[PDB]
């Protein structure tokens, strides 16, 4: 629940952790998110259109 698996658009797969800012509300699967080049943290998510 704390750490999940992410899928990049380019096709390689990775895994990240959980930032102390965001909560487990939007952390649920089925939602496209965003990552950082350093430490692979999460600033926010990426809502589909």
């Amino acid at each position: 629940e704390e750490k999940f698996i992410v899928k990049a658009t380019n096709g390689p797969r990775y895994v990240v952790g959980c930032r102390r800012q965001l909560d487990k509300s939007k952390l649920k699967p089925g939602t496209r998110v965003a990552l950082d080049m350093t430490t692979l943290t999460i600033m926010r998510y990426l809502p589909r259109e």
Binding site: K3, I5, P12, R13, Y14, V15, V16, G17, T39, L40
Partner: protein, 53 residues
């Protein structure tokens, strides 16, 4: 040499006795260094990574 064997052996007694605190130091320190290196190679492993096959 018969009575001298005692006094000559006493040196070996002290020499074998002095190794006690030594092996104490070794066994107490090298385990701390063991867990040190263990956590050193443990912290190498990180959660973020790439998944292969």
């Amino acid at each position: 040499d018969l009575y001298s064997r005692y006094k000559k052996l006493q040196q070996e007694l002290e020499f074998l006795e002095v190794q006690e605190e030594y092996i104490k130091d070794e066994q107490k320190n090298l385990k701390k260094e063991f867990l040190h290196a263990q956590e050193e190679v443990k912290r190498i492993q990180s959660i973020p990574l790439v998944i292969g096959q």
